[PDB]
Amino acid sequence: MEKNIDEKFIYNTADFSIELFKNSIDDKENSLISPLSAMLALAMTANGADNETLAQMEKALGKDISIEDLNKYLYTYMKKLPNEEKSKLTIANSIWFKENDFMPSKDFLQIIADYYKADIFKAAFDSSTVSDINNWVKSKTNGMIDKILNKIDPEDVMYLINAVAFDAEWETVYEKASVHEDIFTDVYGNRQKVEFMNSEENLYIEEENAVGFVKPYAKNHYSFVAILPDENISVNEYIKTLTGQKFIDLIKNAKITLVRASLPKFKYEYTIKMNETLESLGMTDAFLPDKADFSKLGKSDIGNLYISEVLHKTFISVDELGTKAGAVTSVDITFKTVKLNRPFIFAIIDNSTNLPIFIGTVLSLK
């Protein structure tokens, strides 16, 4: 069942992660995605696909990596992602299907149970199912994301859902002396206070049109990457230049040197529909009712299955103690006041691979 995390998986997953990120950026709102969460929901979904639908999904997620191999990689990756006190990362997968109208295939359920440890819910798909799903997402994100849906559409027979919950303390927490209230004018022209957190860091990011730092969480399994585009490039143009290769390299090439770092406390939520991004990665058939082939999922009594929407919800809170971040990705479920003049890109990275568990932008605060 296992397949050792190797350079192929790292750089292929890095490419997916950055392509996902660079196509999920809001113009004014802070953005945040978990490539890991998206990958897992979509990889589960791909195990129900056949023919062209499957080939497109395999390529979108892994390029030359087959779904069988991606299953092994992801199973192994999830197995090895550290989860310790002060350095928590938990992953949860589930499938929800309408028992009356849908008969899931045994091979599919086995793969999903075995490689993805997915909870399998035979459901009524009524108002009580909505409660059950939301309670599940609330539990698996430790309250960070409380709802993913409000109603169930009459055509719905199966949902696939992933949740990721991250909760880590800084290796060195910010003492009171290192936190200061700074004065900003908001979009309405009113003055308010934002707390900024000072530290000494020992990894300095230096690239064309960007500087930044890497700050470790307790036990060093994960770190926080901060990247500040300079006056000669926009946030959007900087993000446009990013590739999986460039992202891994900028972390690898970080210089071991003392840096005076400043990070604002920040907290926000983000919701994005991933259909168009996924179609740009080559995954088109899956979204087409007349073309989609999800015959390996099982048999629906209401015709051929296709993906209606891929929805992504995220949450982050960065403070003096550490960072909590949460994500949900679902398949088939259908304003900040202080504008920063020094906006920045950030990532929460797995230090064993340099892969971004979470990646986002801070354009505004409060």
Side-chain angles (χ1 to χ4, degrees), residues 1-6 8-27 29-51 53-58 60-67 69-84 86-87 89-98 100-102 104-116 118-121 123-137 139-146 148-150 152-154 156-184 186-189 192 194-239 241-254 256-266 268-289 292-301 303-323 325-334 337-365:
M1 276 202 286
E2 294 175 359
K3 188 173 183 74
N4 298 152
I5 308 302
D6 56 13
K8 176 166 278 303
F9 175 83
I10 296 170
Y11 281 99
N12 284 18
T13 303
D15 272 2
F16 166 84
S17 294
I18 298 304
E19 291 307 306
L20 193 62
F21 175 63
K22 76 197 290 182
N23 291 114
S24 302
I25 301 308
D26 198 286
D27 223 32
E29 302 304 317
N30 298 357
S31 304
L32 178 69
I33 68 154
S34 174
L36 179 59
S37 176
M39 172 66 75
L40 292 167
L42 292 164
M44 281 198 292
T45 307
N47 276 280
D50 206 352
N51 304 302
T53 300
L54 173 64
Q56 289 171 11
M57 288 189 82
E58 286 179 318
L61 299 172
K63 301 162 152 192
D64 63 325
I65 304 170
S66 74
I67 191 56
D69 279 351
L70 191 67
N71 288 345
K72 297 194 179 75
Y73 275 134
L74 288 176
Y75 166 78
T76 310
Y77 192 60
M78 289 189 281
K79 190 166 182 169
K80 286 182 75 54
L81 277 168
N83 178 37
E84 301 290 317
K86 304 196 172 197
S87 177
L89 184 61
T90 54
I91 299 163
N93 296 300
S94 61
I95 318 294
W96 304 74
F97 68 89
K98 188 176 181 187
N100 285 160
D101 293 347
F102 186 82
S105 292
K106 171 75 184 182
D107 195 46
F108 171 77
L109 293 179
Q110 195 61 234
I111 294 160
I112 260 60
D114 284 344
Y115 287 88
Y116 296 89
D119 289 328
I120 298 157
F121 294 91
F125 272 55
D126 52 24
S127 63
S128 292
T129 310
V130 173
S131 299
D132 289 337
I133 293 165
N134 289 335
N135 283 320
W136 187 90
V137 300
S139 174
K140 303 303 185 192
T141 66
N142 305 310
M144 286 181 275
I145 292 148
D146 71 330
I148 189 75
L149 86 168
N150 289 10
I152 283 171
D153 298 292
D156 296 346
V157 290
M158 186 200 266
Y159 303 143
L160 304 88
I161 306 168
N162 166 273
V164 171
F166 179 84
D167 186 345
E169 189 167 311
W170 297 119
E171 176 182 60
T172 311
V173 293
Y174 293 96
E175 295 299 314
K176 286 293 181 169
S178 299
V179 179
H180 47 103
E181 291 185 293
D182 292 359
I183 311 163
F184 282 83
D186 65 36
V187 68
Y188 313 117
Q192 52 189 296
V194 178
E195 281 190 303
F196 274 75
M197 311 186 293
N198 291 340
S199 62
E200 285 170 12
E201 301 305 333
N202 288 283
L203 283 180
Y204 184 55
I205 291 160
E206 195 190 68
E207 298 296 327
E208 297 304 294
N209 296 286
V211 299
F213 63 85
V214 186
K215 175 174 188 56
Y217 295 99
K219 301 176 194 176
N220 288 93
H221 304 298
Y222 306 107
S223 294
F224 186 92
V225 172
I227 301 166
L228 183 78
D230 70 22
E231 68 168 279
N232 293 310
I233 202 161
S234 71
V235 159
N236 284 349
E237 182 53 52
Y238 177 84
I239 291 166
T241 70
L242 285 172
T243 67
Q245 177 72 242
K246 284 194 175 292
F247 183 78
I248 302 298
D249 284 359
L250 70 85
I251 295 160
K252 283 187 172 178
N253 294 147
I256 305 165
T257 175
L258 193 67
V259 187
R260 184 164 196 89
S262 169
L263 184 66
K265 295 192 188 174
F266 67 90
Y268 67 89
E269 301 171 327
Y270 192 61
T271 301
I272 191 155
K273 184 174 162 174
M274 280 175 166
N275 289 39
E276 282 187 356
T277 297
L278 290 167
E279 288 171 322
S280 80
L281 294 174
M283 182 183 154
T284 57
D285 279 24
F287 300 101
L288 306 174
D293 189 334
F294 286 103
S295 54
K296 289 180 179 167
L297 283 174
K299 178 164 291 301
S300 169
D301 288 337
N304 285 6
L305 289 198
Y306 68 97
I307 301 172
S308 55
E309 291 195 358
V310 177
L311 190 69
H312 202 243
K313 286 194 66 166
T314 56
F315 166 90
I316 188 157
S317 185
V318 169
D319 63 16
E320 71 289 343
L321 181 67
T323 302
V328 174
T329 312
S330 60
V331 176
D332 249 342
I333 292 171
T334 305
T337 57
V338 179
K339 181 178 183 181
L340 298 184
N341 289 311
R342 302 202 295 161
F344 62 92
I345 289 82
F346 69 89
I348 298 168
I349 61 160
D350 157 30
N351 288 322
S352 74
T353 61
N354 289 336
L355 289 169
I357 307 296
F358 287 85
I359 186 162
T361 54
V362 174
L363 307 183
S364 290
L365 298 175

